[PDB]
């Protein structure tokens, strides 16, 4: 199922809910052990991890260094070692069972820093920084390479993307997206890097484009019916699900589904309540 963790709806949230695209109904599971929005989620070894973010509450606004692990058949969260720095609006990707935490902000500071988590060792290690400071960055893994896409450097929103090579431990700028996107949904469907929605500094976007590594080309595809940034994104049985977000006026509960064979989007569900800035993964 599609798990959604955290989010924001007048305050950061502890929610963990799971959607079943076949049956169409929502499970309510154990609450996070610190309310978080702007976090990222991934799955390693069937375990669901919640990385970074912040607790924006009536009483504070603390950026998060936490990594927390949910066990789907224990329905219980347990803490893992923290990161070197807090990373609000972080991006994460999974290569070879290891979690990469990318970018994000701590207060005024927009990180270019990147670090790696070792599940069976529960250790973080600092690795080569990005060429670019990026928060609200989308991250994706293709051919065991790590891509950092778009985001916001503190001044400009970005259409640039760069690529991290784990065996060189090095970055490389690649071709820029056609659209400036911060807070987009970035994932890997079929064999392209998809970038859906986001915010270009003026409007939330409903456009969607995908990167083909072999031709180093971004192409536009079917756009979503609703503009959104700070959305959750995941692919389930070969189709893209985008989850909540913000359109400049309301917090979306709309969940859209992109069919790559028809190049069409359709609304399949509404989340239990509108929210933005969630961590999403499937397990």
């Amino acid at each position: 199922l599609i798990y959604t963790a955290g989010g924001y709806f007048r305050q950061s949230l502890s929610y963990l809910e799971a959607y079943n695209p076949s049956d169409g109904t929502w499970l309510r599971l154990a609450d996070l052990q610190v309310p978080r929005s702007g976090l990222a989620g991934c799955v390693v070894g069937g375990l669901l991890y919640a990385v970074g973010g912040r607790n924006n509450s009536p009483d504070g606004n603390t950026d998060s260094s936490a990594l927390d692990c949910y066990n789907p058949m224990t329905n219980q969260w347990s803490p893992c070692a923290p990161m070197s720095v807090p990373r609000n609006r972080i991006g994460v990707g999974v290569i070879d069972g290891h979690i990469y935490a990318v970018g994000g902000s701590h207060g005024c500071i927009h990180h270019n820093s990147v670090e790696r988590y070792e599940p069976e060792r529960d250790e973080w290690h600092l690795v080569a920084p990005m060429l670019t400071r990026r928060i609200g960055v989308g991250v994706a893994v293709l051919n065991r390479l790590l891509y950092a896409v778009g985001g916001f450097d503190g001044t400009n929103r970005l259409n640039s993307a760069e690529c991290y090579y784990p065996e060189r431990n090095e970055w490389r700028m690649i071709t820029a997206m056609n659209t400036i996107r911060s807070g987009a949904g970035v994932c890997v469907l079929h064999n392209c890097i998809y970038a859906a929605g986001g915010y270009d500094g003026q409007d939330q976007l409903n456009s969607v484009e995908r990167y083909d590594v072999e031709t180093e080309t971004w192409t536009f595809v079917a756009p979503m019916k609703h503009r959104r940034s700070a959305l959750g994104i995941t692919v389930h049985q070969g189709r893209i699900y985008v989850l909540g977000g913000y359109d400049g006026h309301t917090f979306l509960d709309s969940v859209e589904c992109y069919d790559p064979d028809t190049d069409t989007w359709s609304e399949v569900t509404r989340m239990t309540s509108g929210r933005s800035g969630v961590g999403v993964a499937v397990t």
């Binding site: 924001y8 950061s12 929005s37 702007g38 924006n56 609006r89 609200g136 916001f152 911060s182 807070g183 915010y199 500094g201 939330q204 940034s229 700070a230 913000y246 400049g248 917090f251 933005s276 800035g277």
Partner: peptide, 6 residues
């Protein structure tokens, strides 16, 4: 803020 509503 325009991006996260947060």
């Amino acid at each position: 803020d325009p991006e996260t509503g947060e």
